[PDB]
Ligand binder design. Sequence first.
Ligand SMILES: *[C@@H]1O[C@H](CO)[C@@H](O)[C@H](O)[C@H]1NC(C)=O
Ligand SMILES: *[C@@H]1O[C@H](CO)[C@@H](O)[C@H](O)[C@H]1NC(C)=O
Ligand SMILES: *[C@@H]1O[C@H](CO)[C@@H](O)[C@H](O)[C@H]1NC(C)=O
Ligand SMILES: *[C@@H]1O[C@H](CO)[C@@H](O)[C@H](O)[C@H]1NC(C)=O
Ligand SMILES: *[C@@H]1O[C@H](CO)[C@@H](O)[C@H](O)[C@H]1NC(C)=O
Ligand SMILES: *[C@@H]1O[C@H](CO)[C@@H](O)[C@H](O)[C@H]1NC(C)=O
Ligand SMILES: [Zn+2]
Lengths: 596, 196
Amino acid sequence: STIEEQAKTFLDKFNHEAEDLFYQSSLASWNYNTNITEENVQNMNNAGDKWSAFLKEQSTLAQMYPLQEIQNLTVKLQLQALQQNGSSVLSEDKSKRLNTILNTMSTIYSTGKVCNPDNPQECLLLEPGLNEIMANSLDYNERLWAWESWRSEVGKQLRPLYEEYVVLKNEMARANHYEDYGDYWRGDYEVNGVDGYDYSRGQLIEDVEHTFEEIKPLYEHLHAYVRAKLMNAYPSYISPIGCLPAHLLGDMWGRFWTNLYSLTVPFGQKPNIDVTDAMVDQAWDAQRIFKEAEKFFVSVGLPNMTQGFWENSMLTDPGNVQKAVCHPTAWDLGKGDFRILMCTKVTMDDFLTAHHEMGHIQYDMAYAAQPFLLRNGANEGFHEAVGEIMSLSAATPKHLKSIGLLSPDFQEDNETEINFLLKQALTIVGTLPFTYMLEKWRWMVFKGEIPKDQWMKKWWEMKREIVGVVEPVPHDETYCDPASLFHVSNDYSFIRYYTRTLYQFQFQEALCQAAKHEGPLHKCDISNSTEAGQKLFNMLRLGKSEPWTLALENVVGAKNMNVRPLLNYFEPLFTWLKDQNKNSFVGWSTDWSPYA
Amino acid sequence: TNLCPFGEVFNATRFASVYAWNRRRISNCVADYSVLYNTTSFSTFKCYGVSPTKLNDLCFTNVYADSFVVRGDEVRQIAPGQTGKIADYNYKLPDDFMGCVIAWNSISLDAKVGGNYNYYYRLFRKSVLKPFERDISTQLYQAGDKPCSVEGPDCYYPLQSYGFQSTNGVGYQPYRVVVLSFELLNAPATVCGPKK
Ligand SMILES: *[C@@H]1O[C@H](CO)[C@@H](O)[C@H](O)[C@H]1NC(C)=O
Ligand SMILES: *[C@@H]1O[C@H](CO)[C@@H](O)[C@H](O)[C@H]1NC(C)=O
Ligand SMILES: *[C@@H]1O[C@H](CO)[C@@H](O)[C@H](O)[C@H]1NC(C)=O
Ligand SMILES: *[C@@H]1O[C@H](CO)[C@@H](O)[C@H](O)[C@H]1NC(C)=O
Ligand SMILES: *[C@@H]1O[C@H](CO)[C@@H](O)[C@H](O)[C@H]1NC(C)=O
Ligand SMILES: *[C@@H]1O[C@H](CO)[C@@H](O)[C@H](O)[C@H]1NC(C)=O
Ligand SMILES: [Zn+2]
């Protein structure tokens, strides 16, 4: 017989024999993230090691089958992934310390408490507190203390761990036919099988910059408008020509500017698009948020959540009795078991993420028919983009009025749309420079172009230039501020969030063609449109089988990320921001700092 | 004409795996099919070739009832002329099937916690199963051109184990399947209806 068939009957033995292992890792992994115990860290790691051992043993057996003989391309992808030498190229000396460092940096981030300088026994932790302080407080000193203490008491202790994290990871990628660890992540977007739809590791880094350049004019007029409205909330604390203090931004890191809406809302007297206050007054419990999110996907034809979802998902905080990893997570455990773990509070920012995370589940549920190795998003951005297409539609005032969170007599207006668009731009437009800078810092660190003595200098040298954000307090190289975010302590490719955004408006425009839509790219609730849902269902069911360039093209018509739909969505705001910055400065001075 | 013991095979404590299904002859008794209609727990009660309502009015010389446990989405493979892993390697129904296929959920029984790996199924077989065939073979599966004396790179154990867990989704949940066929011969009606 042929060697391709000899390899088909190898993947078949793999797929059926692998699921109960991955699931077993999953169940234990779920039982730790929802229940923090020393008993369950061991159980999670044992099933992770046995799963890893199954990978190593069934990866070596996969090498014997040569790819060049295989012609069925979908078979080639699955063999290609299973033949990849992962941490196996690392010796027992390297792989242990790498895993030990990765666990240690996650636990420091997980167990990161900051003691009040007065009454040291009072300790605030980043998740329950130290995030309300960094999202609601208008005290510059209180924000300065929550931002600096977190990036010094917690950040500095990660500096030695991150330094050896880079070199041990770089030894892995360079061994496994890459240039650095950054290329390993960049290989997610590579297609090298189909002419015309091909892609390269570097083509991403050029497309991102080429598409980020056309975002910069929009970002500047968002930056200038926010700066002028933050100068009122924090008088004598923000330079009208200079950059923005980091702690005064929406969250702990400046990743999202959503919370600044309260300080930057253009027309306050119009009914609030931020329906967070509306939900609490209507006793919207966490179940309703996901139930209302569920009805949204049902309205477009996508399935109900499985019975195992509601029974086995964790939607609230379990309480003080048992701890939990309350970072929002969607789980494709396998075996038809789909769960969402999230510390859902009664807020619009959690209502939208419930749509976002359920978007992952709808993506996860759709490509479950695909073989195990093809059970994944078309790229990293596709998974995040899919959930955002819903929260893009669900955040519209028409949809909010449809679910009872906005007045039944709510009338749209020129002013309300600006309120809605600006709030969206704070979350979407505001995060693009943050994501582009953060990865470009990590990418150059992995390439080595940023030496170890010029790490923190170059982190804020770019944060002032690219993002227009300044350090409130000078930071030694002893600090490790990049790692203060989750996606860097827990080693996740972060460029997925920049690519996500350009996809999400590319998708929504096409989905708002399949749904017969009159007006602009906003006011585009695809809710109740089965044509919009099924057009996405076709893309979701493919998963990784067809190339993401082809998968995107079949949906929107472009083989690459297009920034034009994003700008057309925000064009009523971009024109309005410029007219609100005639008597204001657009841009930022790199040289100004709040400590000079 | 004592009632046909349909309860023994359906309500049985333990159901066999798919690669070795359990066949029980039913004869020398008047069959009450109306008790089968009433049971609402049957998620997939679909007779093929004969309507259930006229089953009580017709008589057969023999009644074969096959019992086994498949996965949730593999129940569709227990159907005429279907293709897949179970239908081609485990239990194939004739394309001209004249009978019934009944299945219900067995999480409460077959599935527990941890993993109920007790149930097995055939993953590889050289030939496709001829209809109403059972392969109990534990002999390996030589996918390659190298002789098979031990489970190795291309020698695979043909049987694999279902992982049945209460957290699994409907597709991966254990379903007990009973298949009632019929067999008309030149013999008296050993299985009849209550009217006759
Ligand atoms: C959390 O895990 C411990 C052991 O790791 C277990 O005894 C306890 O029952 C679990 N909590 C819940 C609520 O299941
Ligand atoms: C590759 O093999 C699978 C086996 O299930 C088949 O479904 C698929 O159509 C094949 N691809 C091509 C291009 O023939
Ligand atoms: C994996 O490592 C083996 C040696 O252990 C080597 O022969 C093989 O080419 C490697 N595979 C890849 C894809 O680098
Ligand atoms: C979705 O779930 C609701 C809640 O029970 C149910 O009434 C409805 O029939 C379901 N619809 C679909 C399409 O699953
Ligand atoms: C979708 O249809 C339902 C059924 O009448 C309706 O109640 C709901 O308002 C519709 N959704 C929108 C966004 O109009
Ligand atoms: C199984 O037992 C119950 C009562 O124990 C009975 O009502 C039911 O008819 C039985 N099922 C069959 C198929 O005989
Ligand atoms: Zn997400």
